[PDB]
Ligand binder design. Sequence first.
Ligand SMILES: CC(=O)N[C@@H]1[C@@H](O)[C@H](O)[C@@H](CO)O[C@H]1O
Ligand SMILES: CC(=O)N[C@@H]1[C@@H](O)[C@H](O)[C@@H](CO)O[C@H]1O
Ligand SMILES: CC(=O)N[C@@H]1[C@@H](O)[C@H](O)[C@@H](CO)O[C@H]1O
Ligand SMILES: CC(=O)N[C@@H]1[C@@H](O)[C@H](O)[C@@H](CO)O[C@H]1O
Lengths: 323, 323, 323, 160, 159, 160
Amino acid sequence: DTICIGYHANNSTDTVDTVLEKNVTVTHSVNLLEDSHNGKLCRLKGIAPLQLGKCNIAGWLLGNPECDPLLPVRSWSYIVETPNSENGICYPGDFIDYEELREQLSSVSSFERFEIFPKESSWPNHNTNGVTAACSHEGKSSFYRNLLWLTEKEGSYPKLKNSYVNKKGKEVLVLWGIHHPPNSKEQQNLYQNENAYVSVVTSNYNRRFTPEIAERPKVRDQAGRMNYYWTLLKPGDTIIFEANGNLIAPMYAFALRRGFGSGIITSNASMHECNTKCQTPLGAINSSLPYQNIHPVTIGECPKYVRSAKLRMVTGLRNIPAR
Amino acid sequence: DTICIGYHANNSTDTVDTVLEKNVTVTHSVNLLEDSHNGKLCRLKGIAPLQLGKCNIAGWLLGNPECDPLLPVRSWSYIVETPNSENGICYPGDFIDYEELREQLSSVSSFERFEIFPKESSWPNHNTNGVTAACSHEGKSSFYRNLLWLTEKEGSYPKLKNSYVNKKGKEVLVLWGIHHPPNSKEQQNLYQNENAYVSVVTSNYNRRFTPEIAERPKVRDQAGRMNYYWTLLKPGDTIIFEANGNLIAPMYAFALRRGFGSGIITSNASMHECNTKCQTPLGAINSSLPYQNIHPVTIGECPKYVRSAKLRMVTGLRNIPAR
Amino acid sequence: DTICIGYHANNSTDTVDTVLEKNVTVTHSVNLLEDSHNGKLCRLKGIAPLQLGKCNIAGWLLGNPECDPLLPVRSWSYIVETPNSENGICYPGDFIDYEELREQLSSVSSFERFEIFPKESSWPNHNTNGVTAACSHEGKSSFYRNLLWLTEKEGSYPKLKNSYVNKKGKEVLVLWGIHHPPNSKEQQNLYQNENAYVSVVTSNYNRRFTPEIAERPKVRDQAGRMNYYWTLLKPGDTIIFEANGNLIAPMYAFALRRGFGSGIITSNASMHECNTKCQTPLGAINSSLPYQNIHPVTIGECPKYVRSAKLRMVTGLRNIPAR
Amino acid sequence: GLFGAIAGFIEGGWTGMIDGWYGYHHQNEQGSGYAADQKSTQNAINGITNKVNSVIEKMNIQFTAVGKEFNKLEKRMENLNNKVDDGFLDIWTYNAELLVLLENERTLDFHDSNVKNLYEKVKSQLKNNAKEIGNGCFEFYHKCDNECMESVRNGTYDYP
Amino acid sequence: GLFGAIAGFIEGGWTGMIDGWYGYHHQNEQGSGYAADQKSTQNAINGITNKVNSVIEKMNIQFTAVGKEFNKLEKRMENLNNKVDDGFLDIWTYNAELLVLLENERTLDFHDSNVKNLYEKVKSQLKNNAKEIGNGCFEFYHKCDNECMESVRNGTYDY
Amino acid sequence: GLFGAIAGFIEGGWTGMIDGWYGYHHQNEQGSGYAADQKSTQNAINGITNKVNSVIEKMNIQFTAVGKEFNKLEKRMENLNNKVDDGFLDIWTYNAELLVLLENERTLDFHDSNVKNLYEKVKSQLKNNAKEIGNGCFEFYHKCDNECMESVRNGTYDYP
Ligand SMILES: CC(=O)N[C@@H]1[C@@H](O)[C@H](O)[C@@H](CO)O[C@H]1O
Ligand SMILES: CC(=O)N[C@@H]1[C@@H](O)[C@H](O)[C@@H](CO)O[C@H]1O
Ligand SMILES: CC(=O)N[C@@H]1[C@@H](O)[C@H](O)[C@@H](CO)O[C@H]1O
Ligand SMILES: CC(=O)N[C@@H]1[C@@H](O)[C@H](O)[C@@H](CO)O[C@H]1O
């Protein structure tokens, strides 16, 4: 009669590392590192992301004719740009504080695109048909959907002054531009007044713009330049535009609604009808593990990103079949 | 005869967590997490804080009439703002590089407020009694205590040029403003010249200011605007003010003394005659423990802030009363 | 007949700390903390650093006469500034976005200094011999080696317009200045045109400069000021300079080549003919240890810096010679 | 192992025992077989399960974290952001890998210890009613049926 | 326990012993009582006191750390500052909790080990002069007094 | 020590043994002399070598890191950069020092455990052929020359 004390063993080939020894075959263990994703862009808790596609934030907010499909979108869970998001500003120039505008849009859950200055009724004494081949559509010269190029009307450019009172009960993002002719002749032909200026003011914003005329290299086949600006108009405040030339006026503005958890990512993955709580530029993740080595960029509730290739915690004991 | 080997036990109910088991009752343990504090804002190593109360740094430095009680304070251990610190600038406008100025005052242990440009004798050819209902005091129109509103005198605003040589042996904080009328008529009767300018220069500061006239929404009942600026005049250096209008000239400046350990905090707690080595917005801490979960903002020498609710280290053993 | 089981012991005096006991003498141990260096600046993998000596980045790129020895250096592994690197701009002024320029040069592995606008042939209708005592050389008034001071010729300063097309196949760093006289008399006899302006544009850069005339404290015996600017001209792009005064024109520019692992350090150590994979401001390090307490600033592949005085891991056992 | 049992004086494991991590064999007259000790095994499961849940609990979820844009004149700011992101990533990667390596070692010793104590626990019972043979094994003297082999498993035996 | 003594072959503790963490009981002849083994208790006290002091020492004092303001056009900077403060806070909270959890386990095993070693020490001293019985207790054969009991405590038992 | 062997029932080390960390000392009629147990010494070396190497490997190399300049109006940015650098430095110093302290303790317990298990291995061999002197030694009941001593060193002996 014999009684022996022993321990479990099995077929398992699971291995783990320890401080003293590497690749210790063990009976049981648990992986703590998520390395799987579905390779798709999904909805985040039911809400679809905004796919800018061939456009970028600038093209989208200004209304680049190449981004018309985006015009109707009002809500999204996160913003997606692609390696091919090349359609931003179409008329050469500088977009002032663009990175900050992008940061601002990162916490916007939704907005309403509305006419702040109706194309007809806002500028009775100015031409508004200004167009450019730099912003063409259907092989025909066009212009930003949200802005209006004001020009001389019948050899005259009256000093304009238009106001908008924010009665939306929300922040209103207002965008506009300042055009800069390459020479004095053009300035005269387009705006009459040789020494023009543009003034934009609110309760907390105050800026004046002066045309800077000089010959410049052609970009997108234009020597002219357009600088883009923006500001946030607080609920109840009033924005005033005053000019006697060079103003690329606002036509459409955006009443913003703030949210949490959104962000802008860059991905070449496609949108699918899938839902997730965690999205990476490479694909969505469905996991309860504490870590993931899939991607450092995440939207939602995800595992902590680490550069590890393996993180396995032994639970059972050293496996010794003793064969 | 018998002799047994055993271990201590007691009535302790102290509990601690381990990797293998939670809430283990032990004979002896030590708490490493400080969770007790004064309310109460205290002196720091004997020195009292600067309580701006209903005022913010801007109101204090410019001399907002509502911040007079702060005029005599010359030294402090830290600065305290409250949720009600709303009195900053009283005349609408922009305070340029305001956050950087706040950062500067954060390493200032004391200063001397002095007349850099005596109201009487500095501006012989200009009026200086200009006031505004925007900066009212005792129900009457008034103005910043450290600045002077220069205006036309007997139908004229001569070109002025005033300089100050820093012989304080310390950096001198100089502040001033530029006034922006809403229309040219006002620009005319206040400063006579339609194309005015302000120049301010030192050995390392060089800036020019031009009036930007335009109608604007009213703020504090004013359509006008005043932009505020500042610079640090190095010891031995000279600052020159030149202008033919629109200058809100410096009257009082500050000779700064630098120190360490100071900072600006926001608190609704009250100042008491207590002393501490560690102060938080919630109250003072008197401890030698390595951690605290009271507040992440600290002045002085404090335990490291952590989000932990409990951090107790067992010293004794598993308590087994054998009862 | 007896057989005993025991352990090794020797006369090692190596000590290590543990959680329960400090200063424990052990038979064998390994140091993991590098505290040795050869107080010299060495070549990084065969490539020598650029020693600015008494000059700083500004003096080097602008062509301060006191930095002539630097003119021929085309490549380096890292840049070294010293406590005495005082020769930067010699004509008083502000170097715009200077820190950013330093950060740009930090990833530059080499460049070619070339004539973007040859002195003889670029400015036919203007004088190019202006000099200043502020940038003297050999006790004689001189000027920056990479810039040209353009002034009136035969009583007139004609509007100039010159451009350069980048055919280097690399980014070209272009630098220039804008001179600001202390009074209109000087503005007049140097540039004649009272209301002058300078314009500099590329496909992605666009700026206009206006002289700001005002009396200023003399610096380096000069009441005048010169602000310096720069831009990166992309390959194939064109830069156009247009002006009717006040332009401190570019003469030499740099075609940049980028690299990895470089940086700017400050050191008073001397360069020697030595090679290393790890350099600090105090000296070079040759080690395979994981940590070092020599210096936080490092170039190359170095051990991690920590504030520790000692980091020794025990490998042997508690040493008990039992004598 | 730290405690000498697993892969120690008890050379190997029993692919035959599938009821738990630690158990007894028993080769009595009524027959032989395997039987796992619920006490020690279950106790080990509660410890290891708590360990794994602790490691996971401490690594609370990562909320939205995305890149940022910087213009051409904000290189220092872009590099600062980069230093921050790489620094936090270095530390978390280090922390995760070390914790797992360190705790895996501890876990193996934990089991080694449980086998060791289970052994000495049976030994202190049998005392003189059997001897220690092939390590881990005990050769009974009085010969006990499958009924008595059980008294050992449950720890009641009694017969020093 | 890891070493099988505490809550192990020595079921419980003695509320009767109040001089130290580990000790002896003894009785019969001149009476019963408790007595702590100073050698073991002190060594254990030095070790644990060092552990705790090390934990505390490694955490340098937190000097002045306050918030910062950012204007409306410095949102990215504000968020970067936020990412930095939360990132460091996450790390220190994690570090502090893990270190305590891990060391508490170690401390308990340390005590278990001490009891175990003390037991085995007395055992190798008594040998055949006594028999192991009540788990942690040895019943003498030659029947010793009080001065003899002390020789067992200070480890000089003349077999 | 945790396992009671080193500086425990085996009160001291042998400056006379220089072939390894753990070993034996025979004193028969043919003579005396020390002899390191290669089995145990090598295993200890492999474990501690892997430990030290792991610590080193986890601290990947530090690449170029230098200061940055800030203009007089970038004080907040300069302080942010400072908070970042000091913060990472505090963490890595803490990490390095704690890891060494914690592992040095573990290494010492490790050796203690090795001596303990070795002793118990031999004890189980000389079970009934010698008597435990008490402090790591064994007096054989009979002779044990030198060829017999070796049977003990290589884990054979066999003669209960
Ligand atoms: C590269 C490869 O095949 N992987 C193995 C890995 O499983 C093991 O942990 C390591 C240490 O022996 O050796 C590597 O070769
Ligand atoms: C464990 C399981 O059943 N798998 C599902 C998976 O198919 C699904 O995509 C995910 C989304 O909630 O939830 C998991 O639980
Ligand atoms: C040659 C030398 O440096 N002297 C040491 C000596 O001090 C020490 O006693 C001995 C044993 O450790 O090892 C020698 O190498
Ligand atoms: C005789 C026998 O079968 N052994 C059982 C034993 O397994 C159990 O632990 C104990 C208490 O329930 O009762 C005994 O009868």
